[PDB]
Amino acid sequence: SGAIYVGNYRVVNRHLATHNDWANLVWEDSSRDLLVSSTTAQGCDTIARCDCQTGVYYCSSRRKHYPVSFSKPSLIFVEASEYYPARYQSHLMLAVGHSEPGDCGGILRCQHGVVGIVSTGGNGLVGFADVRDLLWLDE
Numbered sequence: 001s002g003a004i005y006v007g008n009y010r011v012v013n014r015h016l017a018t019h020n021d022w023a024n025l026v027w028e029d030s031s032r033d034l035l036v037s038s039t040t041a042q043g044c045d046t047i048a049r050c051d052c053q054t055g056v057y058y059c060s061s062r063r064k065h066y067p068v069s070f071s072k073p074s075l076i077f078v079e080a081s082e083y084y085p086a087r088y089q090s091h092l093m094l095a096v097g098h099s100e101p102g103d104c105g106g107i108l109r110c111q112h113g114v115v116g117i118v119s120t121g122g123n124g125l126v127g128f129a130d131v132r133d134l135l136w137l138d139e
């Protein structure tokens with residue numbers, strides 16, 4: 001579990017969105033596993049606008065933060081699950097690091113701010129749905 005609170009928006013993994021997220025839906029994309037909903041309260045997370053390939057992510061299955069190098073956002077094949085059929089997930093970044101079901105939602109950050117959130121993982125790997133291209137989150 002985990003979300004990004006920026007301005008009047010809440011960004012979460014689409015497969016983990018609630019009834020409230022869908023009733024106040026701003027934008028959603030199954031291929032990216034992202035859903036953004038509107039909020040009444042103001043959010044204060046800063047989103048990074050960079051091309052960093054190093055950062056720190058929160059791993060709830062270990063209750064620890066870990067430094068990682070990560071790949072550039074790209075189309076990556078993702079195995080069938082109870083949420084999606086077998087498909088390519090776009091804007092995904094991979095890193096070597098621990099990750100198990102339940103770590104989705106954990107924030108990945110660089111010196112500039114929030115880069116994205118855990119969405120995939122397995123075999124000593126962790127996939128992060130990137131949010132740096134969503135320039136509208138700020139305005």
Ligand SMILES: NC(=O)[C@H]1CCCN(C(=O)Cc2cccc3c2SCC3)C1
Binds near residue numbers: 099102103120122
């Ligand atoms: N984006 C998707 O289609 C997700 C949907 C849920 C399932 N999924 C996974 O990768 C499961 C998983 C296994 C092992 C470690 C981890 C995970 S998810 C957090 C870390 C794909």
Ligand SMILES: [Zn+2]
Binds near residue numbers: 112113
């Ligand atoms: Zn950065």
